[PDB]
Design a binder for this molecule. Structure first.
Ligand SMILES: *C/C=C1/C(=C/c2[nH]c(/C=C3[NH+]=C(/C=C4\NC(=O)C(C=C)=C4C)C(C)=C\3CCC(=O)O)c(CCC(=O)O)c2C)NC(=O)[C@H]1C
Ligand SMILES: *C/C=C1/C(=C/c2[nH]c(/C=C3[NH+]=C(/C=C4\NC(=O)C(C=C)=C4C)C(C)=C\3CCC(=O)O)c(CCC(=O)O)c2C)NC(=O)[C@H]1C
Lengths: 489, 489
């Protein structure tokens, strides 16, 4: 993923035209509620410092500049050496607490030949986390898991709003569960455009799992100097939780009325599955010991989301097992595929919950249920021959095939399967007039203004030419039956 | 899985003949370092109690018997009602701490219409767990992950021995990492028979993830009464950590010299992947707040084991990618499969690290490398025709095919692939004389004595007629190439 140079290196202004390429990993600034130091990995000499480090460490910038970490932190320097060896990934963190003439929290991570240290004040429900773990593990489905997760984070952090945001293959997520204070606007059930979380944002969020913005009305504190003296290059602050949030997302949060934000990634199989989005109407800083709990819950959700999704599919397959057996049995002892598969006792329509069925064998076809007219069927099979693969799935045929949207009332959803495409089975679902609740704007209205939008209320998009999407278990069952009948002939 | 009736219901004596069917889930007794109460799920009336509950609660058994949990625990009863609704799984636990005229730890779980409560004393490294999490996540391979896990548990619990025990498809596990005190016997690298952890033991360990034996020289405390008054049946103590360990495993631990034991399951995909086995030479009771850390580490290992295994396979596939490309390219433009695939430029031997290659096409075969004689090849293909499937894998051909062990020196490992078996490719690996370090006895010597064995030192079994096992990536690559060449013809 490409990136523009930062603003302090002659970088262009970030607009909705090019926000996809903003270098958020190197803002050259941090958030003011904490101090940041940058030291050498081998010698320990301090190289960079935020302009407010003097207020956090009680010493002048010219005093700390050039001081070795051995003299500044004699009790912690060898632990830093042993904990972060050279060549370790930048996601490895080491945290401790220090006594300063209050108590500070120091989190160090290594980015190449550079040691990054974060200082933020910390203070010194023990079983709510364990009970939360056992509650998440015993949740019956993904919806209940999401409700227990949101309610748990809500009861643990005191945030005004806590929600679980689930991404889609087109990067447009949806609030699947919400735990909010009374009187707040409900974002539950709303879908949001992919523009709100750009590509490099999700990419960064797949590696560094937690980030926050403690005060959306707080100016960032720069570093001195902004360029790393080792390489005369920007300092990678991707792993720093104190990293200055991009001004785009801060203007976005202020337009939403959010005073403080935070999110923890839910990564599954190396892909960003979702986020635990947190909102507070007023500025708020969570103690680090409390954030660690949210990180544990992030790992737990990463595991349980996988488990619960797998189980939710396996239950549907269990629901279709016996029917699969009957169809396979009848198919094995078949002398005419048309007469055998079109038998109502097999009920190939109810298997996939389809309103139309097209069976192509021996150079001819037969229908079953509400189907398009005959020349439309000829055009649909002649269209299917052009597509490669053994399976075709779509909940809106008009998107994959123009001039086929005329067939939307009878055949809007298509699930076809081949045995080349000379002998195939086509499942058709009729059109279902849908209303999608968007959170302010559809993806079409995301690039109309050069700044982040101000409207976030419910926007009901009337989607037409669509059918009910195919459940994942219907597709798994589909290809299983595809290998079955392909083996039978 | 069947079970004998317990000893208190006319059950037979447990020997090595029938230890596979011991009802460990209902010992009718608990470990003496804690108290256990059994109450009704609807009314809260206490129904059962351990014979030492008076020493833990300061009240006579006749006093507590029949008392409602509302009167006994007024501060906790509604929390128990709301936390454990009827119909919830027995793995759901709710833990709190109480002040008793010291401080106790109460863990409650629901088994049907029965509430089970556990009382054990608790006392009131904050960042070692977070640093442990980041260290486990940044481990490069599974071996390093196991070393960091064992070292972490060792430094957190103070156990004399901590090890990671990885199961095999035949339920015979191996100590893949070990963190032990100086001078102790090393179980690292030793394989152990499946008899040590029976079937119902692993089955129970897949659902309830932690169990322990705080003192192997401590007699169990029974319940009063032993039968549940609701059903006149034994009380299921499978979820109770205070459950009396089976006497078989306690005699086993004493024969090993272990004073205190504990293990946390590492479940992956619903299957028991491994265990975090812990040993202490003297009796030891871990505080519950400390065990919760080990449970968190159990979830973390359940996630990271999956990640690291997937990555370790993906690295091998990456190592074979280019070679796969070359073989596919040459195979597409083929006019003679024998001449094309036997070309040394393709190097089909080095792809799978095999010493012999048999190519069967167009009704004839050709060899490549060290292979059995011609009639042995005819018998090997005529044998392959009888086996169904597209792939055959074995690291010891003599096991799958007697009279074929005569071909062990040239062909001990076999990896065959079909395109029926009329046209196939066979990879052969020569015999490798192996020495397997067993921990006391091989599976053959596990049923010679009616009690658990006393010998646990290294027993080097000289395994002959075996080859180097096929790496999982070699098999994935094998079937990928199988669909490739099958599609090419
Ligand atoms: C043209 C660029 C745009 C843009 C940039 C942008 N956005 C982020 C980070 C986030 N955006 C989020 C979106 C949401 N927050 C919500 O509460 C909801 C719905 C209730 C949505 C859809 C989120 C969650 C983040 C992560 C940060 C956080 O949790 O607060 C960044 C990167 C910021 C950073 O962390 O460094 C950037 C550059 N956002 C847009 O809307 C367009 C205009
Ligand atoms: C014929 C029955 C036998 C038998 C029964 C048995 N075993 C268990 C439980 C365990 N056995 C374990 C085995 C090992 N512990 C080790 O340290 C090593 C190698 C260093 C091995 C192979 C383990 C770990 C357990 C789990 C309990 C624990 O962690 O201490 C049970 C069930 C006990 C319970 O928890 O209720 C039973 C009935 N063991 C045999 O060896 C044969 C004779």
């Amino acid at each position: 993923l490409p990136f523009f140079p930062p603003l302090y290196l002659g970088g262009p202004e970030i607009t909705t035209e090019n926000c996809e390429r903003e270098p958020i990993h190197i803002p050259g600034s941090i958030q003011p509620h904490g101090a940041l130091l940058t030291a050498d990995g081998h010698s320990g000499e301090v190289l960079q410092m935020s302009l407010n480090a003097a207020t956090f460490l009680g010493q002048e910038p010219t005093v700390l500049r050039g001081q070795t970490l051995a003299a500044l932190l004699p009790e912690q320097w060898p632990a830093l050496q042993a904990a972060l060896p050279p060549g370790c990934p930048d996601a490895l963190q080491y945290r401790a607490t220090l006594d300063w003439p209050g108590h500070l929290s120091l989190t160090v991570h290594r980015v190449g030949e550079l040691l990054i240290l974060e200082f933020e004040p910390t203070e010194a429900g023990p079983h709510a986390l364990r009970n939360a773990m056992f509650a998440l593990e015993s949740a019956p489905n993904l919806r209940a898991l999401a409700e227990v997760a949101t309610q748990t984070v809500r009861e643990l952090t005191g945030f005004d709003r806590v929600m679980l945001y689930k991404f889609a293959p087109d990067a447009t997520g949806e609030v699947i569960a919400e735990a909010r204070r009374e009187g707040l606007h409900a974002f539950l059930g709303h879908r949001f455009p992919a523009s709100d979380i750009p590509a490099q944002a999700r990419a960064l969020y797949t590696r560094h799992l937690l980030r926050l913005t403690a005060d959306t009305r707080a100016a960032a504190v720069p570093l001195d100097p902004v360029l790393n003296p080792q390489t005369n290059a920007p300092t990678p602050l991707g792993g720093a939780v104190l990293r200055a949030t991009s001004p785009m997302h801060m203007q976005y949060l202020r337009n939403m009325g959010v005073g403080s934000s935070l999110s923890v990634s839910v990564v599954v199989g190396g892909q960003l599955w979702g986020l635990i989005a947190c909102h507070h109407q007023t500025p708020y800083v969570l103690p680090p010991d409390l954030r660690t709990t949210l990180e544990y819950l992030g790992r737990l959700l990463s595991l349980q989301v996988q488990v619960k999704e797998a189980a939710d599919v396996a239950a549907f397959r269990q629901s279709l097992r016996e029917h699969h057996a009957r169809v396979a049995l009848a198919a094995a002892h078949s002398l005419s595929p048309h007469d055998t598969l079109s038998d109502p006792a097999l009920d190939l329509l109810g298997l996939m919950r389809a309103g139309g069925l097209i069976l192509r064998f021996e150079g001819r076809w037969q229908t079953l249920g509400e189907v398009p007219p005959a020349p439309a069927v000829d055009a649909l099979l002649a269209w299917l021959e052009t597509q490669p693969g053994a399976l075709v799935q779509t909940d809106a045929l008009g998107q994959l095939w123009p001039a086929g949207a005329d067939l939307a009332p009878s055949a809007a959803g298509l699930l076809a399967i081949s045995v080349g495409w000379s002998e195939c089975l086509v499942w058709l679902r009729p059109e279902l007039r849908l209303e999608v609740a968007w959170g302010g704007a559809t993806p079409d209205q995301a690039k109309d203004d050069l700044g982040p939008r101000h409207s976030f209320d419910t926007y009901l998009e009337e989607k037409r030419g669509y059918a009910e999407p195919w459940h994942p278990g219907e597709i798994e069952e589909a290809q299983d039956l595809r290998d079955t009948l392909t083996g039978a002939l």
